[PDB]
Amino acid sequence: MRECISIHVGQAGVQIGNACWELYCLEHGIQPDGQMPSDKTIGGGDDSFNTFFSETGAGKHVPRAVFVDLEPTVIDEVRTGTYRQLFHPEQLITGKEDAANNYARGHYTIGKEIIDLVLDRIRKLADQCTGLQGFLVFHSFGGGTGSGFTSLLMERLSVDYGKKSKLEFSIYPAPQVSTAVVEPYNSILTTHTTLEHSDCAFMVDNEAIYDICRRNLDIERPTYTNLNRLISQIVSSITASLRFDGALNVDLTEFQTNLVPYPRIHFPLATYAPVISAEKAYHEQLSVAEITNACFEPANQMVKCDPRHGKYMACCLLYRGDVVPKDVNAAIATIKTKRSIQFVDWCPTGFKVGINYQPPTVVPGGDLAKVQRAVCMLSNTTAIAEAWARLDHKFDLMYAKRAFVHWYVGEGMEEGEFSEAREDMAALEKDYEEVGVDSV
Amino acid sequence: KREHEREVIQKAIEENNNFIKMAKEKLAQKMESNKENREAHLAAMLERLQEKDKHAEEVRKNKELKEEA
Amino acid sequence: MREIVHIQAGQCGNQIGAKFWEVISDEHGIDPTGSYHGDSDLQLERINVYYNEATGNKYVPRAILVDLEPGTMDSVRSGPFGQIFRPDNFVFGQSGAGNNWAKGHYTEGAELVDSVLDVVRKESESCDCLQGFQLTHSLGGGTGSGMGTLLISKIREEYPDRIMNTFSVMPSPKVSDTVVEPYNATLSVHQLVENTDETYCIDNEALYDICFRTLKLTTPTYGDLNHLVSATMSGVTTCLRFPGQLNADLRKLAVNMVPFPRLHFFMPGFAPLTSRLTVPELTQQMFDSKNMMAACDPRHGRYLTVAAIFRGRMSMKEVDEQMLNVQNKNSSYFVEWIPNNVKTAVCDIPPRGLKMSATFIGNSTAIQELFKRISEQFTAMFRRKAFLHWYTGEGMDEMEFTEAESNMNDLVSEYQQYQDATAD
Ligand SMILES: CC[C@H](C)[C@@H]([C@@H](CC(=O)N1CCC[C@H]1[C@H](OC)[C@@H](C)C(=O)N[C@H](C)[C@@H](O)c1ccccc1)OC)N(C)C(=O)[C@@H](NC(=O)[C@@H](NC)C(C)C)C(C)C
Ligand SMILES: Nc1nc2c(ncn2[C@@H]2O[C@H](COP(=O)(O)OP(=O)(O)OP(=O)(O)O)[C@@H](O)[C@H]2O)c(=O)[nH]1
Ligand SMILES: Nc1nc2c(ncn2[C@@H]2O[C@H](COP(=O)(O)OP(=O)(O)O)[C@@H](O)[C@H]2O)c(=O)[nH]1
Numbered sequence: 016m017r018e019c020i021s022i023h024v025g026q027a028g029v030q031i032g033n034a035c036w037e038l039y040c041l042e043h044g045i046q047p048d049g050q051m052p053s054d055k056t057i058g059g060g061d062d063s064f065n066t067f068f069s070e071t072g073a074g075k076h077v078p079r080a081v082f083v084d085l086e087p088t089v090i091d092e093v094r095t096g097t098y099r100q101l102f103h104p105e106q107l108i109t110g111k112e113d114a115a116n117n118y119a120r121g122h123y124t125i126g127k128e129i130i131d132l133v134l135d136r137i138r139k140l141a142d143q144c145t146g147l148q149g150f151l152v153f154h155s156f157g158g159g160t161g162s163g164f165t166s167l168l169m170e171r172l173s174v175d176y177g178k179k180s181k182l183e184f185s186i187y188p189a190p191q192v193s194t195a196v197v198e199p200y201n202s203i204l205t206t207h208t209t210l211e212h213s214d215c216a217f218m219v220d221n222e223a224i225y226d227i228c229r230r231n232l233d234i235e236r237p238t239y240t241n242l243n244r245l246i247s248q249i250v251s252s253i254t255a256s257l258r259f260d261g262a263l264n265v266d267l268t269e270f271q272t273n274l275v276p277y278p279r280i281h282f283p284l285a286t287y288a289p290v291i292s293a294e295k296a297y298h299e300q301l302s303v304a305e306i307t308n309a310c311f312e313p314a315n316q317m318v319k320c321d322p323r324h325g326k327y328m329a330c331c332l333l334y335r336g337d338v339v340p341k342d343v344n345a346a347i348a349t350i351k352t353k354r355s356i357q358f359v360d361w362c363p364t365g366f367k368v369g370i371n372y373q374p375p376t377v378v379p380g381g382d383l384a385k386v387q388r389a390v391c392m393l394s395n396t397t398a399i400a401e402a403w404a405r406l407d408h409k410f411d412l413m414y415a416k417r418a419f420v421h422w423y424v425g426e427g428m429e430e431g432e433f434s435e436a437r438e439d440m441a442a443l444e445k446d447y448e449e450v451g452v453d454s455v
Numbered sequence: 456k457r458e459h460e461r462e463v464i465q466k467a468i469e470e471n472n473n474f475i476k477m478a479k480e481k482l483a484q485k486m487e488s489n490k491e492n493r494e495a496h497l498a499a500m501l502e503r504l505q506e507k508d509k510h511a512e513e514v515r516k517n518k519e520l521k522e523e524a
Numbered sequence: 525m526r527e528i529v530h531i532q533a534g535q536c537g538n539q540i541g542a543k544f545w546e547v548i549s550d551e552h553g554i555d556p557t558g559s560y561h562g563d564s565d566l567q568l569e570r571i572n573v574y575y576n577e578a579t580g581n582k583y584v585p586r587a588i589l590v591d592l593e594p595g596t597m598d599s600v601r602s603g604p605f606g607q608i609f610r611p612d613n614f615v616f617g618q619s620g621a622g623n624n625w626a627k628g629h630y631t632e633g634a635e636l637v638d639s640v641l642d643v644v645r646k647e648s649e650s651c652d653c654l655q656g657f658q659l660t661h662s663l664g665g666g667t668g669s670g671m672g673t674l675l676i677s678k679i680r681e682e683y684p685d686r687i688m689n690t691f692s693v694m695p696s697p698k699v700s701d702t703v704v705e706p707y708n709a710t711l712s713v714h715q716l717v718e719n720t721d722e723t724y725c726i727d728n729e730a731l732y733d734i735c736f737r738t739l740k741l742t743t744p745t746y747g748d749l750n751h752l753v754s755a756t757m758s759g760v761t762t763c764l765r766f767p768g769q770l771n772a773d774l775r776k777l778a779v780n781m782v783p784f785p786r787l788h789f790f791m792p793g794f795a796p797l798t799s800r801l802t803v804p805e806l807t808q809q810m811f812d813s814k815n816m817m818a819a820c821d822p823r824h825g826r827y828l829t830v831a832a833i834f835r836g837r838m839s840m841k842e843v844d845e846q847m848l849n850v851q852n853k854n855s856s857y858f859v860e861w862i863p864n865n866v867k868t869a870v871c872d873i874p875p876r877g878l879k880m881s882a883t884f885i886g887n888s889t890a891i892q893e894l895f896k897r898i899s900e901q902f903t904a905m906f907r908r909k910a911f912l913h914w915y916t917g918e919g920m921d922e923m924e925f926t927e928a929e930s931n932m933n934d935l936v937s938e939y940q941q942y943q944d945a946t947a948d
């Protein structure tokens with residue numbers, strides 16, 4: 016019951032999936048061959064970790080996950096890597112030719128050749144569930160597959176599963192690690208196409224993560240491996256309420272109720288603490304009060320933007336580890352005194368809090384210190400729209416000269432789809448302005 | 456009150472079904488339009504290349520005509 | 525898994541072609557007999573992009589050698605790496621093209637083109653997933669320029685969805701005194717603007733100037749020029765041949781480099797340029813006009829797009845800092861309406877004989893200087909209708925010359941239009 020199916024799309028989605036599933040295995044005590052000695056029910060069960068793992072008669076715990084990419088070389092590393100036994104081969108799906116950083120190839124020319132096979136494999140996972148809750152979809156904004164195939168997939172999932180919930184983890188581009196000049200086009204196209212199909216989307220700004228790795232972990236030039244280990248901790252924080260239970264645990268769906276006041280306003284800002292190196296964490300106790308305060312420091316946000324220049328519509332705190340109610344209540348009291356957190360006039364101001372007692376885990380060879388307690392704040396702030404404005408501006412610069420547009424038109428797209436997508440983004444920015452205005 | 460309860464749940468079903476229906480139709484429209492556009496772009500490209508072939512035939516025809524004179 | 529088919533045509537095409545295969549064979553640890561004897565797995569990771577595997581673990585270049593006379597190809601065959609090529613992939617006539625584009629394109633070349641296509645199909649059929657074609661050729665002669673462009677058209681007809689890439693050697697009076705060269709080049713450029721996706725402009729003018737002025741070679745040989753060419757071709761194909769993130773295949777390169785379909789002519793550059801370095805120095809030099817393989821000053825135009833490739837063991841932090849520095853300090857020379865238009869790749873494997881090197885690929889509107897130089901030479905002959913009988917005698921019409929000139933001048937106009945454009 017309450018199963019969640021994860022779908023990892025394109026290089027970024029797949030590589031982040033690697034990092035997340037490895038971390039989940041460590042958190043639950045699952046070996047790379049999928050055995051879990053602590054699990055006494057063989058071949059099934061309804062424990063909390065079963066929302067994310069099915070089981071075979073032979074004791075294997077198998078991710079409820081599909082990996083899909085339009086070329087094989089990234090998923091091939093999964094197929095031959097450390098966790099190769101973890102996945103059934105049919106969960107790992109590849110084509111031969113990728114989308115070449117072109118939304119149109121991912122959604123149409125190339126994506127159309129594999130979409131039916133992908134849905135068939137998702138259906139096999141869905142059939143195993145006794146109460147499927149929804150999907151978690153991981154993908155880049157910038158890549159041709161991450162943008163175009165994800166959009167196609169989300170549209171097809173709405174048809175095949177109706178309003179079954181679909182959440183996204185979406186990688187927002189940064190120039191330090193970007194690989195295509197047309198990423199703003201792909202970003203706007205996929206955000207427009209997916210908007211009415213997604214219930215909640217957590218944007219992960221690669222520049223924010225890049226900065227945190229440089230500044231907090233003293234990593235000179237972060238790699239995708241550095242970025243993805245940090246990202247996976249944030250994803251783990253957010254999915255922890257689904258995978259563990261405890262008296263103080265609050266389900267992700269309850270946070271979602273508070274976080275989404277209108278269907279289109281569904282992009283929470285995540286902020287995570289503590290991000291600290293072993294060297295600096297040694298002989299340093301980071302209290303509940305300290306990690307909570309860090310949630311309101313924009314340096315720790317997953318998306319670059321300034322909530323102090325915006326208004327809040329909701330604030331959720333997701334704690335894990337050695338965290339007791341009295342300390343959380345005292346920390347929030349302090350914050351409400353010292354920080355001006357301004358809410359819109361039509362929302363209550365109380366923070367919604369969940370606590371999971373299982374402490375954070377780290378993967379061997381990482382740069383993150385292992386800590387006794389951590390927190391992820393999820394906030395609904397008008398400031399998140401800053402991220403749209405930056406992308407929309409880059410789109411506008413190129414589109415005004417129709418730069419690169421012929422690559423899309425040559426694959427069957429029309430200029431009307433570009434302008435329609437950009438107009439939807441203009442309307443989204445206007446929606447975020449409007450919810451911030453005081454009531455009459 | 457019971458009639459109202461029935462109406463509310465049938466409304467929920469109808470709106471879910473209509474969402475699926477319109478998603479389904481939008482997608483079929485988009486895919487057909489894309490297919491036709493891409494095929495037309497390829498057709499035009501081939502058409503131009505085939506005109507080059509014809510032109511080349513004329514060039515050789517022209518050379519042959521010049522030759523005996 | 526993503527194969528490239530290589531075609532080399534005419535004297536120049538086969539000369540630089542052979543050198544390219546010698547150079548990357550060494551980089552991938554392939555010996556002249558096709559046997560692998562290398563030290564690192566990174567050498568074999570993407571070997572199938574350029575080589576077929578045969579029995580007994582032999583690697584054979586996916587290469588087709590084309591000419592209308594047999595001399596150069598005989599030279600290649602009894603070369604160092606002559607035996608590495610597939611014998612059936614040598615396709616040659618006997619009568620030559622006499623430095624006549626019309627012979628290459630309409631007459632002699634047209635008689636040989638079908639047997640070349642037979643070899644192309646054989647190589648393409650056995651591909652797991654063909655990405656496209658790369659052609660080496662000169663624009664000044666008759667076979668490479670005329671038959672080379674004919675092959676492009678024919679291949680495009682049967683593979684219209686694949687990428688077509690050329691390494692095109694531009695003629696210069698300094699290197700050769702053949703009078704008809706601007707005709708052959710202008711007729712060629714007319715074909716390339718319509719039918720290739722990306723063309724590297726290898727300018728003999730620039731090659732001669734580097735050899736004479738920089739390398740201080742009093743009398744540069746063709747061998748000297750080709751040394752630059754092979755270094756360059758190695759550099760710009762590094763991201764295709766070794767594992768990597770950026771511009772890792774022909775189509776992703778094109779999507780990053782070509783904002784408008786006709787503007788697909790690149791100015792390559794290489795550092796260091798030496799004959800008998802810090803990251804800041806590498807970076808300075810690769811953006812330096814003295815290091816460009818096309819005879820154009822980038823400070824006389826603006827960059828639409830740039831790809832930079834660094835090779836060797838170096839600090840990626842430093843490379844990132846220096847690339848940001850170059851763009852910031854020279855912001856006027858990058859079009860503001862294409863954000864983030866400079867992409868950088870680093871490959872750990874240096875080229876033979878260097879600790880580190882840098883290769884530059886620019887789509888700069890200053891490339892119009894190259895086309896203007898040709899156009900000037902062209903029009904000087906064509907205004908007085910000089911030497912046209914060579915071409916009309918093969919059946920060509922004057923109007924085709926006019927159209928070719930017209931198209932090339934249009935290409936120049938378009939570079940200027942985008943050089944002049946502003947964001948606001
Ligand atoms: C500047 C134009 C080319 C570059 C030079 C060069 C030709 C060359 O290198 N030639 C003519 C094929 C033989 C080759 C060289 O000969 C010494 C060998 C060693 C070679 O470079 N071999 C290389 C490794 C080989 O791959 C190869 C490449 C191309 C062709 C043949 C062989 O010789 C100085 N030439 C014609 C010249 O310098 C001649 N200059 C002129 O003709 C001038 N007008 C009088 C202009 C056109 C340059 C002088 C000899 C009078
Ligand atoms: N955080 C993170 N970002 C990544 C990773 N891989 C790629 N990206 C980002 O994703 C964008 C590029 O899209 P990719 O996911 O590589 O492309 P793809 O989905 O495989 O699509 P095609 O290759 O075009 O078929 C750029 O913004 C990259 O910085 C990763 O492992 N982690
Ligand atoms: N860089 C370089 N240029 C060459 C070489 N051989 C010929 N060329 C140039 O190519 C043009 C002549 O074309 P060529 O290839 O000799 O004629 P083809 O055999 O009919 O293609 C002239 O501008 C020459 O300067 C070479 O080995 N290297």
Ligand SMILES: [Ca+2]
Nearest residue numbers: 054056059060
């Ligand atoms: Ca069990």
Ligand SMILES: [Mg+2]
Nearest residue numbers: 025026113160
């Ligand atoms: Mg990819």
Ligand SMILES: [Mg+2]
Nearest residue numbers: 535536623665
């Ligand atoms: Mg010659």
